[PDB]
Amino acid sequence: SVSKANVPKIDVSPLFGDDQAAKMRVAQQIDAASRDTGFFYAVNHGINVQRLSQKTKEFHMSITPEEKWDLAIRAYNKEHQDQVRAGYYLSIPGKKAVESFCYLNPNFTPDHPRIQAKTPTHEVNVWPDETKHPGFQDFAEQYYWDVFGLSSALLKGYALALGKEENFFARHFKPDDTLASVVLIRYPYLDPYPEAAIKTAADGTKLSFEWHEDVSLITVLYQSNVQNLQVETAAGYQDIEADDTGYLINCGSYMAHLTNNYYKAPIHRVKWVNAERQSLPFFVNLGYDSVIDPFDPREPNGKSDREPLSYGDYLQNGLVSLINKNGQT
Ligand X SMILES: CC(C)[C@@H](NC(=O)[C@H](CS)NC(=O)CCC[C@H](N)C(=O)O)C(=O)O
Kindly state whether residue 99 participates in binding Fe ion, applying the rule CB under 5 A. no
Q: Quick one: 74 or 212, whose CB is closer to ligand X? A: 212
Q: Quick one: 173 or 295, whose CB is closer to ligand X? A: 173
Kindly state whether residue 166 participates in binding Fe ion, applying the rule CB under 5 A. no
Q: Quick one: 238 or 304, whose CB is closer to Fe ion? A: 238
Q: Rounded CA gap, 323 and 329, in Å?
A: 8
In degrees, rounded to 5, the angle at the alpha carbon of residue 198 between the alpha carbons of residues 195 and 200 is: 115
DSSP 72: B
Q: Quick one: 137 or 326, whose CB is closer to ligand X? A: 326
The binding site for ligand X (CB under 6 A) comprises 85, 102, 181, 183, 185, 209, 212, 214, 221, 270, 279, 281, 283, 319, 322, 329
Q: Rounded CA gap, 146 and 46, in Å?
A: 9
Helices and strands (H and E) in the chain: how many: 7, 13
Cβ of residue 298: shortest distance to ligand X, in angstroms?
A: 27
Q: Rounded CA gap, 287 and 280, in Å?
A: 22
Q: Is 277 annotated as a binding residue?
A: yes
Cβ of residue 168: shortest distance to ligand X, in angstroms?
A: 23
Q: Rounded CA gap, 278 and 98, in Å?
A: 10
Q: Rounded CA gap, 188 and 82, in Å?
A: 28
Report what 221 binds from Fe ion, ligand X, none; CB cut-off 5-8 Å by kind. Answer: ligand X
Q: Quick one: 133 or 268, whose CB is closer to Fe ion? A: 268
Cβ of residue 83: shortest distance to ligand X, in angstroms?
A: 10
Q: Among candidates 40, 41, 43, 39, which has minimal Cα distance to 265?
A: 39
By CB under 5 A, name the one of 214, 248, 278, 285 that touches Fe ion: 214
Report what 329 binds from Fe ion, ligand X, none; CB cut-off 5-8 Å by kind. Answer: ligand X
- For the chain, the straight-line distance linking the first and the last C-alpha, in angstroms and rounded, comes to 30
Q: Rounded CA gap, 231 and 54, in Å?
A: 28
Q: Rounded CA gap, 226 and 248, in Å?
A: 13
Cβ of residue 19: shortest distance to ligand X, in angstroms?
A: 32
**Is the Cβ–Cβ distance between 297 and 163 less than 8 Å?**
yes
Cβ of residue 270: shortest distance to ligand X, in angstroms?
A: 5
DSSP 15: G
Q: Among candidates 167, 279, 296, 174, which has minimal Cα distance to 229?
A: 279
Q: Is 214 annotated as a binding residue?
A: yes
**Is the Cβ–Cβ distance between 308 and 292 less than 8 Å?**
yes
Q: Which residue is nearest to Fe ion (CB)?
A: 214
Report what 263 binds from ligand X, Fe ion, none; CB cut-off 5-8 Å by kind. Answer: none
Report what 183 binds from ligand X, Fe ion, none; CB cut-off 5-8 Å by kind. Answer: ligand X
**How crowded is residue 95: how many other Cβ atoms within 10 Å of its Cβ?**
10
Cβ of residue 302: shortest distance to ligand X, in angstroms?
A: 29
Q: Is 310 annotated as a binding residue?
A: no
Candidates 62-70, 173-181, 206-214, 227-235 — which segment interacts with Fe ion by CB under 5 A?
206-214
Positions marked catalytic = 209, 212, 214, 268
**Is the Cβ–Cβ distance between 159 and 168 less than 8 Å?**
yes
Q: Is 187 annotated as a binding residue?
A: yes
Q: Is 85 annotated as a binding residue?
A: yes
Q: Quick one: 63 or 154, whose CB is closer to Fe ion? A: 154
Binding site for Fe ion (CB under 5 A): 214
User: What residues form the annotated binding site?
Assistant: 85, 89, 181, 187, 212, 214, 268, 277, 279
User: What residues form the annotated binding site for Fe(2+)?
Assistant: 212, 214, 268
